[PDB]
Coordinates of C-alpha atoms in Angstrom, one line a residue:
Chain A
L244 CA 138.1 269.7 -25.5
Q245 CA 135.3 270.0 -23.0
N246 CA 131.6 269.9 -23.5
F247 CA 128.2 270.2 -21.8
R248 CA 124.7 269.8 -23.3
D249 CA 121.6 270.9 -21.5
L250 CA 118.8 273.5 -21.4
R251 CA 118.4 273.2 -25.2
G252 CA 122.1 273.8 -25.7
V253 CA 124.9 271.6 -27.2
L254 CA 128.1 273.5 -26.4
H255 CA 131.1 271.5 -27.6
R256 CA 134.6 273.0 -27.6
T257 CA 137.6 271.1 -29.0
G258 CA 141.3 271.3 -28.4
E259 CA 141.1 274.8 -26.9
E260 CA 139.2 276.4 -24.0
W261 CA 136.0 278.3 -23.4
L262 CA 134.5 279.0 -20.0
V263 CA 130.9 279.7 -19.2
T264 CA 129.6 282.8 -17.4
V265 CA 126.9 281.0 -15.4
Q266 CA 123.3 282.1 -16.2
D267 CA 122.2 278.7 -15.3
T268 CA 119.3 277.1 -13.5
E269 CA 119.5 273.6 -12.4
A270 CA 122.5 272.8 -14.9
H271 CA 123.9 269.3 -14.2
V272 CA 127.6 270.1 -14.8
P273 CA 129.7 267.0 -14.5
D274 CA 129.4 263.8 -16.6
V275 CA 131.3 260.5 -16.9
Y276 CA 131.6 260.7 -13.1
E277 CA 134.5 263.1 -13.6
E278 CA 134.2 266.9 -13.3
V279 CA 135.1 269.6 -15.8
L280 CA 138.1 270.4 -13.5
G281 CA 136.1 271.7 -10.6
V282 CA 132.6 273.1 -10.1
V283 CA 132.5 276.9 -9.5
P284 CA 129.5 278.2 -7.6
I285 CA 129.3 281.9 -8.1
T286 CA 127.7 282.1 -4.6
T287 CA 130.8 281.1 -2.6
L288 CA 133.6 281.5 -5.1
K318 CA 135.5 286.1 -10.3
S319 CA 132.8 288.5 -9.2
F320 CA 129.8 289.5 -11.4
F321 CA 131.2 291.9 -14.0
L322 CA 134.8 290.8 -13.7
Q323 CA 136.2 287.4 -14.8
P324 CA 139.4 285.8 -13.4
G325 CA 142.1 286.0 -16.1
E326 CA 144.6 285.9 -13.2
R327 CA 148.4 285.7 -13.4
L328 CA 151.2 285.0 -11.0
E329 CA 150.1 288.0 -8.9
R330 CA 146.6 286.4 -8.6
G331 CA 145.1 289.7 -9.9
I332 CA 141.9 289.7 -11.9
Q333 CA 142.2 291.2 -15.4
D334 CA 139.0 291.2 -17.5
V335 CA 136.1 293.4 -16.4
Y336 CA 133.2 295.3 -17.9
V337 CA 131.5 298.6 -16.8
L338 CA 127.8 299.5 -16.9
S339 CA 127.1 301.9 -14.0
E340 CA 129.1 303.8 -11.5
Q341 CA 128.5 301.0 -9.0
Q342 CA 130.0 298.6 -11.6
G343 CA 133.0 300.8 -11.9
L344 CA 133.7 300.2 -8.3
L345 CA 133.8 296.5 -8.9
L346 CA 135.9 297.1 -12.0
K347 CA 138.4 298.9 -9.8
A348 CA 138.2 296.2 -7.1
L349 CA 139.9 293.5 -9.2
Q350 CA 143.0 295.7 -9.6
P351 CA 144.2 296.4 -6.0
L352 CA 143.1 292.9 -4.8
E353 CA 145.8 290.3 -4.2
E354 CA 146.3 288.3 -1.0
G355 CA 143.3 287.6 1.4
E356 CA 143.4 290.7 3.6
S357 CA 144.0 292.7 0.4
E358 CA 141.1 291.4 -1.6
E359 CA 138.8 291.6 1.4
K360 CA 139.7 295.2 2.1
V361 CA 139.3 296.1 -1.6
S362 CA 136.2 293.9 -1.8
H363 CA 134.6 296.0 1.0
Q364 CA 135.8 299.2 -0.6
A365 CA 133.7 298.2 -3.6
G366 CA 130.5 298.5 -1.7
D367 CA 131.8 301.0 0.9
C368 CA 132.2 303.5 -2.0
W369 CA 128.4 303.6 -2.6
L370 CA 126.4 306.8 -2.2
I371 CA 126.8 309.1 0.7
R372 CA 126.8 306.5 3.5
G373 CA 123.6 307.6 5.4
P374 CA 124.2 311.2 6.6
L375 CA 120.5 311.9 6.9
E376 CA 117.2 310.6 5.5
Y377 CA 116.2 313.4 3.1
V378 CA 119.0 313.2 0.6
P379 CA 118.5 315.0 -2.8
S380 CA 121.6 315.9 -5.0
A381 CA 122.5 319.6 -4.7
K382 CA 125.5 319.1 -6.9
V383 CA 127.1 321.9 -9.0
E384 CA 127.7 320.9 -12.6
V385 CA 128.8 322.7 -15.8
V386 CA 128.4 321.4 -19.3
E387 CA 127.8 317.7 -18.4
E388 CA 131.0 317.6 -16.2
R389 CA 130.2 317.4 -12.5
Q390 CA 132.0 320.4 -11.2
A391 CA 131.7 320.2 -7.4
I392 CA 129.5 318.2 -5.0
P393 CA 128.2 320.3 -2.1
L394 CA 126.2 318.8 0.8
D395 CA 125.1 320.9 3.8
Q396 CA 122.9 319.9 6.8
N397 CA 123.6 319.7 10.5
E398 CA 127.1 319.4 12.1
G399 CA 128.6 319.3 8.7
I400 CA 129.1 321.0 5.3
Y401 CA 130.5 318.5 2.7
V402 CA 132.5 319.8 -0.2
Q403 CA 133.9 317.4 -2.8
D404 CA 135.9 319.0 -5.5
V405 CA 138.3 317.7 -8.2
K406 CA 139.6 320.8 -9.9
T407 CA 141.2 322.3 -6.7
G408 CA 141.8 319.3 -4.4
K409 CA 139.9 316.3 -3.1
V410 CA 137.3 316.5 -0.3
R411 CA 136.8 318.6 2.8
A412 CA 134.1 318.2 5.5
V413 CA 134.2 320.3 8.6
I414 CA 131.5 319.5 11.3
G415 CA 129.5 322.3 12.8
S416 CA 126.7 322.2 15.3
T417 CA 123.9 324.3 13.8
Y418 CA 125.4 326.9 11.6
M419 CA 128.5 327.6 9.4
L420 CA 129.6 330.2 11.9
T421 CA 129.4 327.7 14.8
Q422 CA 131.7 325.5 12.8
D423 CA 134.2 328.3 12.8
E424 CA 133.5 328.9 16.5
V425 CA 134.1 325.3 17.6
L426 CA 137.2 325.3 15.4
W427 CA 138.5 328.5 16.9
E428 CA 138.1 326.9 20.3
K429 CA 140.0 323.8 19.1
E430 CA 142.7 325.8 17.4
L431 CA 146.4 325.0 17.5
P432 CA 147.9 328.1 19.3
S433 CA 147.5 326.1 22.5
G434 CA 150.0 323.2 21.8
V435 CA 152.8 325.8 21.7
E436 CA 153.6 324.9 25.3
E437 CA 153.9 321.2 24.5
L438 CA 156.2 321.8 21.6
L439 CA 158.3 324.0 23.9
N440 CA 159.1 320.9 26.0
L441 CA 159.3 318.6 22.9
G442 CA 162.5 320.3 21.9
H443 CA 161.7 322.6 19.0
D444 CA 159.3 325.6 19.4
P445 CA 157.7 326.2 15.9
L446 CA 154.4 327.9 17.0
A447 CA 151.5 327.3 14.5
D448 CA 147.9 328.6 14.6
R449 CA 145.3 328.4 11.9
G450 CA 142.0 330.3 11.7
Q451 CA 138.3 329.5 12.1
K452 CA 137.6 329.8 8.4
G453 CA 140.5 327.5 7.5
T454 CA 142.7 330.6 7.5
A455 CA 146.4 329.8 7.4
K456 CA 148.5 331.8 9.9
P457 CA 151.4 329.4 10.8
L458 CA 154.8 330.4 9.4
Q459 CA 158.5 329.4 10.0
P460 CA 161.2 331.4 11.9
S461 CA 164.9 330.9 11.9
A462 CA 165.2 328.7 15.0
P463 CA 168.2 326.3 15.1
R464 CA 167.8 326.9 18.9
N465 CA 167.1 330.6 19.1
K466 CA 167.0 333.6 16.7
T467 CA 163.5 335.2 17.3
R468 CA 160.3 335.4 15.2
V469 CA 159.4 338.7 13.8
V470 CA 157.0 339.8 11.0
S471 CA 155.3 343.1 10.3
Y472 CA 152.4 343.4 7.9
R473 CA 150.9 346.8 7.1
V474 CA 148.8 348.8 4.5
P475 CA 145.4 347.8 3.2
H476 CA 145.7 344.1 4.2
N477 CA 146.1 343.5 7.9
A478 CA 148.1 346.1 10.0
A479 CA 149.5 343.5 12.5
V480 CA 153.1 342.9 13.5
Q481 CA 153.7 339.7 15.5
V482 CA 157.0 339.9 17.3
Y483 CA 157.9 336.7 19.2
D484 CA 161.1 336.1 21.2
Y485 CA 162.6 332.8 22.3
Chain B
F195 CA 97.1 258.0 -13.9
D196 CA 98.9 255.4 -16.0
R197 CA 101.8 256.5 -18.2
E198 CA 102.7 260.2 -18.8
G199 CA 99.1 261.3 -19.4
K200 CA 96.1 261.4 -17.1
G201 CA 93.4 258.8 -17.6
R202 CA 90.3 260.9 -16.6
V203 CA 91.1 262.7 -13.3
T204 CA 89.5 266.2 -12.7
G205 CA 89.9 268.9 -10.1
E206 CA 86.8 271.1 -9.7
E207 CA 84.3 271.7 -6.9
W208 CA 81.2 273.5 -5.4
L209 CA 79.5 273.5 -2.0
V210 CA 76.2 272.5 -0.5
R211 CA 75.5 274.5 2.7
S212 CA 72.2 272.8 3.0
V213 CA 70.5 271.7 6.1
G214 CA 69.5 268.0 6.3
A215 CA 71.2 265.4 4.2
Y216 CA 72.9 262.1 5.0
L217 CA 76.1 262.8 3.0
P218 CA 78.1 259.6 2.7
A219 CA 77.8 257.4 -0.4
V220 CA 79.3 253.9 -0.9
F221 CA 81.1 254.0 2.5
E222 CA 83.1 257.1 1.7
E223 CA 82.0 260.6 2.6
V224 CA 81.8 263.5 0.1
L225 CA 85.4 264.3 1.2
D226 CA 84.9 266.0 4.5
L227 CA 82.3 266.5 7.3
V228 CA 81.9 270.0 8.9
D229 CA 79.3 271.9 10.8
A230 CA 78.7 275.7 10.2
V231 CA 81.3 278.2 11.2
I232 CA 78.5 280.7 11.6
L233 CA 80.3 283.1 9.2
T234 CA 81.2 286.8 9.1
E235 CA 80.3 289.7 11.5
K236 CA 82.7 292.3 10.1
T237 CA 85.3 290.2 8.1
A238 CA 86.0 289.9 4.4
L239 CA 88.3 288.3 1.9
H240 CA 91.2 289.7 -0.2
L241 CA 91.4 288.1 -3.6
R242 CA 94.7 288.1 -5.4
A243 CA 95.6 286.2 -8.6
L244 CA 92.5 284.3 -9.7
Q245 CA 90.4 284.2 -6.5
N246 CA 86.7 284.1 -6.1
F247 CA 83.8 284.1 -3.7
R248 CA 80.0 283.6 -4.3
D249 CA 77.4 284.5 -1.7
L250 CA 74.7 286.9 -0.7
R251 CA 73.4 286.9 -4.3
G252 CA 76.9 287.7 -5.7
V253 CA 79.2 285.7 -8.0
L254 CA 82.5 287.7 -7.8
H255 CA 85.1 285.9 -9.9
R256 CA 88.5 287.5 -10.6
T257 CA 91.1 285.9 -12.8
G258 CA 94.9 286.3 -13.1
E259 CA 95.0 289.6 -11.3
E260 CA 93.8 290.8 -7.9
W261 CA 90.8 292.6 -6.3
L262 CA 90.2 292.9 -2.6
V263 CA 86.8 293.4 -0.9
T264 CA 86.0 296.3 1.4
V265 CA 83.9 294.2 3.8
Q266 CA 80.2 295.2 4.0
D267 CA 79.3 291.7 4.8
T268 CA 77.1 289.9 7.1
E269 CA 77.6 286.2 7.8
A270 CA 79.8 285.8 4.7
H271 CA 81.5 282.3 4.7
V272 CA 84.9 283.4 3.2
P273 CA 87.1 280.3 2.7
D274 CA 86.3 277.3 0.4
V275 CA 88.2 274.1 -0.6
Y276 CA 89.3 274.0 3.1
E277 CA 92.0 276.6 2.1
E278 CA 91.7 280.3 2.8
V279 CA 91.9 283.3 0.4
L280 CA 95.4 283.9 1.9
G281 CA 94.1 284.9 5.4
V282 CA 90.8 286.1 6.9
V283 CA 90.8 289.8 7.8
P284 CA 88.3 290.8 10.5
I285 CA 87.9 294.6 10.4
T286 CA 87.3 294.4 14.2
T287 CA 90.7 293.4 15.3
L288 CA 92.9 294.1 12.2
Chain C
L244 CA 161.8 261.5 -28.7
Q245 CA 158.8 261.9 -26.5
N246 CA 155.1 261.9 -27.4
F247 CA 151.5 262.3 -26.2
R248 CA 148.2 261.9 -28.1
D249 CA 144.9 263.1 -26.7
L250 CA 142.2 265.7 -27.1
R251 CA 142.3 265.3 -30.9
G252 CA 146.1 265.8 -31.0
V253 CA 148.9 263.5 -32.0
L254 CA 152.0 265.4 -30.9
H255 CA 155.1 263.3 -31.7
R256 CA 158.6 264.7 -31.3
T257 CA 161.8 262.7 -32.2
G258 CA 165.4 263.0 -31.2
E259 CA 165.1 266.5 -29.9
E260 CA 162.8 268.3 -27.3
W261 CA 159.6 270.3 -27.2
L262 CA 157.7 271.1 -24.0
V263 CA 154.0 271.9 -23.7
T264 CA 152.6 275.1 -22.2
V265 CA 149.7 273.4 -20.5
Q266 CA 146.2 274.5 -21.7
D267 CA 144.9 271.1 -20.9
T268 CA 141.8 269.7 -19.3
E269 CA 141.8 266.2 -18.1
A270 CA 145.0 265.3 -20.1
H271 CA 146.3 261.8 -19.1
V272 CA 150.1 262.6 -19.4
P273 CA 152.1 259.4 -18.6
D274 CA 152.0 256.1 -20.7
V275 CA 153.9 252.8 -20.5
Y276 CA 153.6 253.2 -16.7
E277 CA 156.6 255.5 -17.0
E278 CA 156.4 259.3 -16.9
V279 CA 157.6 261.9 -19.4
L280 CA 160.4 262.7 -16.8
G281 CA 158.0 264.2 -14.2
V282 CA 154.5 265.7 -14.1
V283 CA 154.4 269.5 -13.7
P284 CA 151.2 270.9 -12.3
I285 CA 151.1 274.6 -12.9
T286 CA 149.2 275.0 -9.7
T287 CA 151.9 274.0 -7.3
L288 CA 155.1 274.3 -9.5
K318 CA 157.6 278.6 -14.6
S319 CA 154.9 281.1 -13.9
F320 CA 152.2 282.1 -16.5
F321 CA 153.9 284.3 -19.0
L322 CA 157.5 283.2 -18.2
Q323 CA 158.9 279.7 -19.0
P324 CA 161.9 278.1 -17.2
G325 CA 164.9 278.1 -19.5
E326 CA 167.0 278.2 -16.4
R327 CA 170.8 277.9 -16.1
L328 CA 173.3 277.3 -13.3
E329 CA 172.0 280.4 -11.5
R330 CA 168.5 278.9 -11.6
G331 CA 167.2 282.1 -13.2
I332 CA 164.2 282.0 -15.5
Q333 CA 165.0 283.4 -19.0
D334 CA 162.1 283.3 -21.5
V335 CA 159.1 285.6 -20.9
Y336 CA 156.5 287.5 -22.8
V337 CA 154.7 290.8 -22.1
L338 CA 151.1 291.8 -22.7
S339 CA 150.1 294.3 -20.0
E340 CA 151.8 296.3 -17.3
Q341 CA 150.8 293.6 -14.8
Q342 CA 152.5 291.1 -17.1
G343 CA 155.7 293.3 -17.2
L344 CA 155.9 292.8 -13.4
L345 CA 156.0 289.0 -13.8
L346 CA 158.4 289.5 -16.7
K347 CA 160.7 291.4 -14.3
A348 CA 160.1 288.8 -11.5
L349 CA 162.0 286.0 -13.3
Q350 CA 165.2 288.1 -13.4
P351 CA 165.9 289.0 -9.7
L352 CA 164.6 285.6 -8.5
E353 CA 167.1 283.0 -7.4
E354 CA 167.2 281.1 -4.1
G355 CA 164.0 280.5 -2.1
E356 CA 163.9 283.7 -0.1
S357 CA 164.9 285.6 -3.2
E358 CA 162.2 284.2 -5.5
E359 CA 159.6 284.6 -2.8
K360 CA 160.4 288.3 -2.2
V361 CA 160.5 289.0 -5.9
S362 CA 157.4 286.8 -6.4
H363 CA 155.6 289.0 -3.9
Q364 CA 157.0 292.2 -5.5
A365 CA 155.3 291.0 -8.7
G366 CA 151.9 291.5 -7.2
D367 CA 152.9 294.1 -4.6
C368 CA 153.7 296.4 -7.5
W369 CA 150.0 296.5 -8.6
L370 CA 148.0 299.7 -8.6
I371 CA 148.1 302.2 -5.7
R372 CA 147.7 299.7 -2.8
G373 CA 144.3 300.9 -1.4
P374 CA 144.8 304.6 -0.3
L375 CA 141.1 305.3 -0.5
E376 CA 138.0 304.0 -2.2
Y377 CA 137.3 306.7 -4.8
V378 CA 140.5 306.3 -7.0
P379 CA 140.4 308.0 -10.5
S380 CA 143.7 308.8 -12.3
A381 CA 144.6 312.5 -12.1
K382 CA 147.9 311.8 -13.9
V383 CA 149.8 314.5 -15.9
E384 CA 150.8 313.4 -19.4
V385 CA 152.3 315.0 -22.4
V386 CA 152.3 313.5 -25.9
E387 CA 151.6 309.9 -24.9
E388 CA 154.5 309.9 -22.4
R389 CA 153.2 309.8 -18.8
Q390 CA 154.9 312.9 -17.4
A391 CA 154.1 312.9 -13.6
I392 CA 151.6 311.0 -11.5
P393 CA 150.0 313.2 -8.8
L394 CA 147.6 311.8 -6.2
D395 CA 146.3 314.1 -3.4
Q396 CA 143.7 313.3 -0.6
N397 CA 143.9 313.2 3.2
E398 CA 147.1 313.0 5.1
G399 CA 149.1 312.7 2.0
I400 CA 150.0 314.3 -1.4
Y401 CA 151.6 311.7 -3.7
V402 CA 154.0 312.8 -6.4
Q403 CA 155.7 310.2 -8.7
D404 CA 158.1 311.7 -11.2
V405 CA 160.7 310.2 -13.5
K406 CA 162.3 313.3 -15.2
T407 CA 163.5 314.8 -11.9
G408 CA 163.8 312.0 -9.4
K409 CA 161.7 309.1 -8.2
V410 CA 158.8 309.4 -5.8
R411 CA 157.9 311.7 -2.9
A412 CA 154.9 311.4 -0.5
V413 CA 154.6 313.6 2.5
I414 CA 151.7 313.0 4.9
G415 CA 149.5 315.9 6.0
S416 CA 146.4 315.9 8.2
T417 CA 143.9 317.9 6.2
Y418 CA 145.7 320.5 4.1
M419 CA 149.1 321.0 2.3
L420 CA 149.9 323.8 4.8
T421 CA 149.3 321.4 7.7
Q422 CA 151.8 319.0 6.2
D423 CA 154.3 321.9 6.3
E424 CA 153.2 322.6 9.9
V425 CA 153.6 319.1 11.2
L426 CA 156.9 318.9 9.4
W427 CA 158.0 322.2 10.9
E428 CA 157.3 320.7 14.3
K429 CA 159.1 317.5 13.5
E430 CA 162.1 319.4 12.0
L431 CA 165.8 318.6 12.7
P432 CA 167.1 321.7 14.5
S433 CA 166.3 319.9 17.7
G434 CA 168.7 317.0 17.4
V435 CA 171.6 319.5 17.5
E436 CA 171.9 318.7 21.2
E437 CA 172.3 315.0 20.6
Chain D
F195 CA 119.5 250.9 -21.6
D196 CA 121.5 248.2 -23.4
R197 CA 124.7 249.1 -25.2
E198 CA 125.7 252.8 -25.9
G199 CA 122.2 253.9 -27.0
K200 CA 119.0 254.1 -25.1
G201 CA 116.2 251.5 -25.8
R202 CA 113.1 253.7 -25.3
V203 CA 113.6 255.7 -22.0
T204 CA 111.9 259.2 -21.7
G205 CA 112.1 262.0 -19.2
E206 CA 109.0 264.3 -19.3
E207 CA 106.1 265.0 -16.9
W208 CA 103.0 266.9 -15.9
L209 CA 100.8 267.1 -12.7
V210 CA 97.4 266.2 -11.5
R211 CA 96.4 268.4 -8.6
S212 CA 93.0 266.7 -8.6
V213 CA 90.9 265.8 -5.6
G214 CA 89.8 262.1 -5.4
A215 CA 91.8 259.4 -7.2
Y216 CA 93.3 256.1 -6.0
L217 CA 96.7 256.7 -7.7
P218 CA 98.7 253.4 -7.6
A219 CA 98.7 251.1 -10.6
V220 CA 100.1 247.6 -10.7
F221 CA 101.5 247.8 -7.1
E222 CA 103.7 250.8 -7.9
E223 CA 102.5 254.3 -7.2
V224 CA 102.7 257.1 -9.8
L225 CA 106.2 258.0 -8.4
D226 CA 105.3 259.8 -5.2
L227 CA 102.4 260.5 -2.8
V228 CA 101.9 264.0 -1.4
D229 CA 99.1 266.1 0.1
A230 CA 98.6 269.8 -0.8
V231 CA 101.1 272.4 0.5
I232 CA 98.3 274.9 0.4
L233 CA 100.4 277.1 -1.9
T234 CA 101.4 280.9 -2.1
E235 CA 100.3 283.8 0.2
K236 CA 102.9 286.3 -1.1
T237 CA 105.7 284.1 -2.6
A238 CA 106.8 283.7 -6.2
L239 CA 109.4 282.0 -8.4
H240 CA 112.5 283.2 -10.1
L241 CA 113.1 281.5 -13.4
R242 CA 116.7 281.4 -14.7
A243 CA 117.9 279.3 -17.8

């Protein structure tokens, strides 16, 4: 049983509840000197499209979607709990906006098939960005000017060097990828020592890598 | 201005840029006393929502929308009612 | 035999009990100067969907479900006893929310068969998350960029070294 | 404002932005006395409820 009358509106509830979703201008709010139970300014603070149904775990329940940006806020109310939690998730709501300023000239060279957005490519300078969902998540490898140069810089920064560190670490595994994300690391029988042999031939890659320990 | 409504009060004006005339009547002045600014060399006025200017054989009155002037003035007075059009714009300094 | 009349409500009990589940605004509560036996503000404190039926082991009994999030609270009242116990379980109620912020862009690439949620996969960066229930519990092995690299890093961190210890 | 109800009291208004007029009547003023703010260059108002 709480009520408020203003702006050409007599809203009278009785023996049950009903909260208001703001949309007010200069609304007086309290009467009889007492409050409704506490004024709630949507400026300081329940965030736009999601109302606080909240339970013991202080999680927000009710929420509505309208746009992708709204879906972010819709998600926000779920992983938000204690202060640091809601703050992180709150930021993640905006953080997950469009491509956070890679360059000025941003179109949308996205690949799509029958309405469903297939893959989201995005190439430019020191980076080729590939977001997929039917074969993984997202991959972005920085270049310098060309795709090749990405492979080059990677090839320079490749793992076959750390082999010496691992030697001292205690267990020599020896891994080494390839420029084009080529996977070459394998696993030998090495409780302590027992070599590392492998011989590939025929139309594929005639290369035998024999390694001793 | 008694209760709720207004007795007779009215807000409207016009200006006499005429040389030679006492001015004050019944102790009070017209409302202000100013000498000539010696107007516009290469300035003009930008009229926005309902703004007007009358001079040089020209009554240009806009209403509820805008319309800026592209100068081409000589000695154009520009502001009236003491207030400006929103700001004088001399095409010499810009 | 306790009663309260307000907000267009004459609630009179007699010779037996009946507690109220709040839902009040500005309700006066005590009369005759005396209390009902003690005011219970649901703000400080019995937690939302679960009422304190409580026995010698101070455990909450009655509870209702509505959503998954509610089921968490429903569970909460069971493993909660002494302070440190109820606090831990109380936290676990919220702690067990959705995937606690792995990344921003979180959809729901879960595998399901005939209504029953089969498995819950979740891949991204430095981690592939696989929650199952028909062949175990949950497994999450961190990578660096690719599945292979997970295997690599693991291969480096493998046990055959401790043999000396 | 006697008991429960209101005698005659009324809250409504309108403004005279007119140049030249004494203003006060029977000792009291209209309710306030202000000179022109010299309004809006590039401002506006957002109307809500």
